[PDB]
Amino acid sequence: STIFPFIGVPEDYILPKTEELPIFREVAWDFEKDEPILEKGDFKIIEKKEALKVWIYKCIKTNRYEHEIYSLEYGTELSELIGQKYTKGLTESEASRFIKEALLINPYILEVNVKSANFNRDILSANVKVSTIY
Template sequence: MSLFPIIQPQAAPEIDVSLPMYRETAWDYQKNEPIWENGAPVIVEGKAAVLVWAWNALHTPRYRYEIYSWDFGNEVDNLTGQSFSDDLKRSEAARFTRECLLINPYITDIKDLAISFAGDVLTISGTIVTVYGEVELNV
């Protein structure tokens, strides 16, 4: 009898990790409101839907609204009123943006992220790499 018997573990069953097609309500980015047609919301799929999700996540402060999970939204509001240098503010805004977007399993990377402040207006642009391809982000 051995103190350490040989155990033959069974292989874990393979899990289907494919994601279903992502669908979201189409968004009018100029008016910042959903698009309706004949009394019903217009639905978009794929990378256009992921872009709508990203737009809304970046426009929603994290932890402020009970309707959203604590994973949804951004924390850029934490920079308001802080006496940080401009470089530190841009760096933190980039970090908050990445944390906000990469929580979505349909988003695999963010490229060419550019952050700028003009007074009290924050502008974010870059390329979101999704499972469906790349899409340009301008918020």
């Protein structure tokens, strides 16, 4: 009977209550052998920071623009630094930036710091601190 003078239908104007992010859960992973972990004949699900460890490991391990399935923001660019394409200081600064920007897309991660950086032989070492909501 009565007209609806707005675009759409009354159903589209119901807003679900905004709540905290649901608890982060992920399939367990074995870093030494690079395999998912089975428990009692099924996949094993871990919670909170362990799942975050799995996600961070997987994110760091991939290259940024190599795969079609991923968007342009997923992955890291650490492969461009191999072979000393830049000076040592430029490589250090770029590595810090790459790690920070790659990791920060996850809404469960609040801040990232790359603190220690040392060149010994052909190896580059660094320390990374990640702060989450947990």
